[PDB]
Amino acid sequence: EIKSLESSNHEFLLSAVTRMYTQIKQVWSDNVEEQVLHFERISNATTNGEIL
Amino acid sequence: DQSLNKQENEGFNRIGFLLKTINNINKLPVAFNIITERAKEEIHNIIVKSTESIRSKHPSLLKMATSLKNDNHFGLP
Protein backbone atom coordinates (compact mmCIF):
# COMPACT_ATOMS: atom_id res chain seq x y z
CA GLU A 1 0.00 0.00 0.00
CA ILE A 2 2.99 2.26 0.54
CA LYS A 3 3.83 1.16 -3.01
CA SER A 4 0.47 2.75 -3.83
CA LEU A 5 0.34 5.57 -1.25
CA GLU A 6 3.84 6.33 0.01
CA SER A 7 4.48 5.85 -3.62
CA SER A 8 3.85 9.55 -3.86
CA ASN A 9 1.65 11.91 -5.86
CA HIS A 10 1.64 9.74 -9.00
CA GLU A 11 -1.52 10.39 -8.47
CA PHE A 12 0.27 12.72 -10.81
CA LEU A 13 -1.73 15.96 -10.37
CA LEU A 14 1.51 17.93 -10.27
CA SER A 15 1.19 17.48 -14.05
CA ALA A 16 -1.71 19.90 -13.65
CA VAL A 17 0.85 22.23 -12.06
CA THR A 18 2.85 21.47 -15.19
CA ARG A 19 -0.30 22.27 -17.17
CA MET A 20 -0.83 25.76 -15.72
CA TYR A 21 2.84 26.41 -14.93
CA THR A 22 3.65 25.12 -18.40
CA GLN A 23 0.58 26.93 -19.69
CA ILE A 24 2.28 30.17 -18.57
CA LYS A 25 6.06 29.63 -18.67
CA GLN A 26 5.74 27.84 -22.02
CA VAL A 27 3.28 30.33 -23.54
CA TRP A 28 6.32 32.03 -25.12
CA SER A 29 6.68 29.28 -27.77
CA ASP A 30 3.19 28.15 -28.80
CA ASN A 31 1.77 31.69 -28.78
CA VAL A 32 5.02 32.87 -30.41
CA GLU A 33 3.43 31.56 -33.60
CA GLU A 34 -0.05 32.45 -32.31
CA GLN A 35 0.00 35.92 -30.72
CA VAL A 36 -2.81 37.04 -33.08
CA LEU A 37 -3.95 33.48 -33.43
CA HIS A 38 -7.52 33.67 -34.73
CA PHE A 39 -6.71 36.83 -36.75
CA GLU A 40 -3.77 38.58 -38.43
CA ARG A 41 -3.61 41.92 -36.58
CA ILE A 42 -0.39 41.00 -34.78
CA SER A 43 0.09 38.61 -37.75
CA ASN A 44 0.25 35.14 -36.25
CA ALA A 45 -1.12 31.72 -37.21
CA THR A 46 -3.75 30.00 -35.08
CA THR A 47 -1.48 27.16 -33.90
CA ASN A 48 -0.41 26.28 -30.37
CA GLY A 49 -0.76 22.50 -29.92
CA GLU A 50 -2.37 20.23 -27.33
CA ILE A 51 0.79 18.34 -26.30
CA LEU A 52 0.82 17.67 -22.55
CA ASP B 1 29.44 21.13 -23.17
CA GLN B 2 26.92 19.32 -25.35
CA SER B 3 28.98 16.19 -24.74
CA LEU B 4 28.96 17.07 -21.04
CA ASN B 5 25.15 16.82 -21.07
CA LYS B 6 24.64 14.34 -23.92
CA GLN B 7 40.38 30.54 -17.66
CA GLU B 8 39.94 27.71 -20.15
CA ASN B 9 40.09 30.11 -23.16
CA GLU B 10 37.40 31.24 -23.11
CA GLY B 11 35.30 29.92 -20.27
CA PHE B 12 33.10 33.02 -20.14
CA ASN B 13 31.39 32.01 -23.40
CA ARG B 14 29.90 28.68 -22.42
CA ILE B 15 29.93 29.64 -18.74
CA GLY B 16 28.06 32.93 -18.79
CA PHE B 17 25.92 31.93 -21.73
CA LEU B 18 25.15 28.63 -20.03
CA LEU B 19 24.24 29.63 -16.47
CA LYS B 20 22.68 32.78 -17.85
CA THR B 21 20.91 31.26 -20.83
CA ILE B 22 19.69 28.07 -19.14
CA ASN B 23 18.26 29.95 -16.14
CA ASN B 24 15.46 31.36 -18.25
CA ILE B 25 11.98 30.01 -17.49
CA ASN B 26 9.99 31.44 -20.45
CA LYS B 27 12.96 31.62 -22.77
CA LEU B 28 11.32 31.03 -26.13
CA PRO B 29 10.19 34.61 -26.86
CA VAL B 30 13.32 36.10 -25.34
CA ALA B 31 15.49 34.17 -27.81
CA PHE B 32 13.64 35.97 -30.59
CA ASN B 33 14.09 39.18 -28.58
CA ILE B 34 17.88 39.02 -28.44
CA ILE B 35 17.88 37.87 -32.07
CA THR B 36 15.71 40.60 -33.53
CA GLU B 37 17.30 43.38 -31.50
CA ARG B 38 20.86 42.24 -31.83
CA ALA B 39 21.09 41.52 -35.57
CA LYS B 40 20.48 44.96 -37.01
CA GLU B 41 21.10 47.11 -33.98
CA GLU B 42 24.12 45.26 -32.70
CA ILE B 43 25.81 44.72 -36.07
CA HIS B 44 25.39 48.35 -37.02
CA ASN B 45 26.11 49.28 -33.40
CA ILE B 46 29.58 47.74 -33.38
CA ILE B 47 30.40 48.44 -37.03
CA VAL B 48 29.36 52.02 -36.44
CA LYS B 49 30.89 52.17 -32.99
CA SER B 50 34.52 51.35 -33.78
CA THR B 51 34.70 53.71 -36.76
CA GLU B 52 33.22 56.40 -34.55
CA SER B 53 35.82 55.67 -31.87
CA ILE B 54 38.70 56.15 -34.27
CA ARG B 55 36.70 58.84 -36.11
CA SER B 56 37.12 61.16 -33.15
CA LYS B 57 39.82 59.37 -31.11
CA HIS B 58 42.86 60.62 -32.95
CA PRO B 59 41.11 62.16 -35.93
CA SER B 60 42.58 64.30 -37.77
CA LEU B 61 41.12 62.90 -40.95
CA LEU B 62 43.81 65.28 -42.15
CA LYS B 63 45.26 63.45 -45.05
CA MET B 64 41.85 64.60 -46.15
CA ALA B 65 41.16 63.13 -49.40
CA THR B 66 44.46 61.51 -50.40
CA SER B 67 46.06 64.87 -49.82
CA LEU B 68 45.55 64.56 -53.63
CA LYS B 69 48.27 61.89 -53.75
CA ASN B 70 47.92 60.60 -57.29
CA ASP B 71 46.33 58.40 -58.13
CA ASN B 72 46.96 55.19 -57.33
CA HIS B 73 48.91 56.26 -54.35
CA PHE B 74 46.67 53.45 -53.31
CA GLY B 75 46.99 53.22 -49.55
CA LEU B 76 50.57 54.29 -50.01
CA PRO B 77 51.48 55.08 -46.41
CB A37 within 8 A of CB B38: no
Nearest CA among B33, B13, B53 for reference residue A28: B33
Residues B45 and B47: their CA atoms lie apart, in Å, by: 6
Resolution (A): 15.0
* Residues of chain B found within 8 Å of residue A26, distances taken between Cβ atoms: 26, 28
* Residues of chain B found within 8 Å of residue A24, distances taken between Cβ atoms: 26
C-alpha dist (Å) from residue A34 to A42, B22, B61: 9, 24, 52
Judged by a CB distance cut-off of 8 A, whether residue B28 touches chain A is yes
**DSSP state letters, B40-67:** IIIHHHHHHHHHHHHHHHS----SGGGG
Judged by a CB distance cut-off of 8 A, whether residue A7 touches chain B is no
What are phi and psi for residue A18, nearest 5 degrees? -75, -15
Sequence-distant (≥ 6) Cβ neighbours of residue B73 within 8 angstroms: B66
Give the torsion sign (CA, A31, A36, A40, A43): negative
Judged by a CB distance cut-off of 8 A, whether residue A45 touches chain B is no
Residues B13 and B6: their CA atoms lie apart, in Å, by: 19
